Amino acid sequence: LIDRLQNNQRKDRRLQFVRTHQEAFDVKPTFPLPLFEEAILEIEGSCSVESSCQVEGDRLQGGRYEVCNNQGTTWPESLTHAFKLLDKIDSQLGVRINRDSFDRFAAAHVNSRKIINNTIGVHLGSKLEDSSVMLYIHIKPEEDTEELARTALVLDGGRYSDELTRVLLRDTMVIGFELFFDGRSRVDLGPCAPKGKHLEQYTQKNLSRKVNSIFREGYLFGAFFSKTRVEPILFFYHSIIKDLPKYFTFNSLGDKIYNFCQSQGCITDVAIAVTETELEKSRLENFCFYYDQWDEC
């Protein structure tokens, strides 16, 4: 009985995270946000909700969430949530989804024992056609996962140097599939470091001093590469929110997100996603700010 009651309370907290974020950042409940809220209520067990704001100068896009079960391995049953969501979204008039890459990856690795889960997520854009479904595959850190990374690399179809190919083949811990509602899709390969030594080395040899001076200060460092990206997007994960001002200076919108985060409970970690190029600037104008809340808080 107590497990059942706790289970209903997690579901309520999940929704409250998502709603509190909409309130704080003036997000309109535009398609597909209502549908997404219904979808995450169907996830069993305890979930983490990772909300974010994409900032672009004085523009802020706040209707961005990734949700997943945070209690061990739910692959491949976690796929059912993704497919249900995609089915609901595709049936919307004026929405077109190219799910080929995700379907092929899912088909290929359904029986893999090296995958923790997939997430489900949505990113609202300024208009319907710029909005997307976002799906991340989280790979087990302590497995040799070259075969997963190869499949993703093939679906991405980018051409990388020998050095970067090895980083991607060996240290990829997350794979992103972004499905835009105008029919564009993207595959992100996500090498991470606390796996990691190839990314660390690549970073030390190739990336700016500013990147090198901060990337080991959080508990995790990641970079997303894609054929679609001229340069990777770098992610800096921190478990102590108050440490962010030590390493980043924000434009006004970033300060607002930062302040909001420091007043909110239940936050287990934050991340700043930014390009090397944008990190060179005196102030961050173009970046994404992520924060993660656990529904048992």
Author numbering: 3 to 196, 205 to 307
Paper passage:
The patellamides are eight-residue cyclic peptides containing oxazolines, thiazoles and d-amino acids and are derived from a ribosomally produced precursor peptide. The patellamide gene cluster has been identified (seven genes; patA–patG) and the majority of the proteins or their contributing domains have been assigned specific functions. PatF has been shown to be essential for patellamide production in vivo; however, to date its function has not been confirmed. Cyanobactin family members related to PatF have been shown to possess prenyltransferase activity.
Here, we report the crystal structure of PatF, the first from this cyanobactin enzyme family, to a resolution of 2.1 Å and provide evidence to suggest that it is likely to be an inactive prenyltransferase. The crystal structure of PatF has been solved and comprises a β-­barrel core surrounded by α-helices, which is a known motif for prenyltransferases. PatF is a globular protein with approximate dimensions of 45 × 43 × 53 Å. There is a single disulfide bridge at the C-­terminus linking Cys276 and Cys307. The final refined model contains residues 3–196 and 205–307 of chain A and residues 2–196 and 205–307 of chain B. The missing residues are found on the connecting loop between β8 and α8 and also at the N- and C-termini, all of which are presumed to be disordered. Electrostatic surface-potential representations of PatF highlight a highly electronegative central pore that could disfavour binding of the electronegative DMAPP. Two key interactions of DMATS were identified to involve Lys187 and Asp178, which both play a role in binding DMAPP. In PatF, the structurally equivalent residues to Lys187 and Asp178 are Met136 and His125, respectively. These significant changes mean that Met136 would not form the same salt-bridge interaction as the lysine in DMATS, while His125 would have a repulsive effect on Arg66 (the equivalent of Arg100 in DMATS) rather than a stabilizing interaction. Our data, together with the lack of prenylation of any natural patellamide, indicate that PatF is an inactive prenyltransferase.
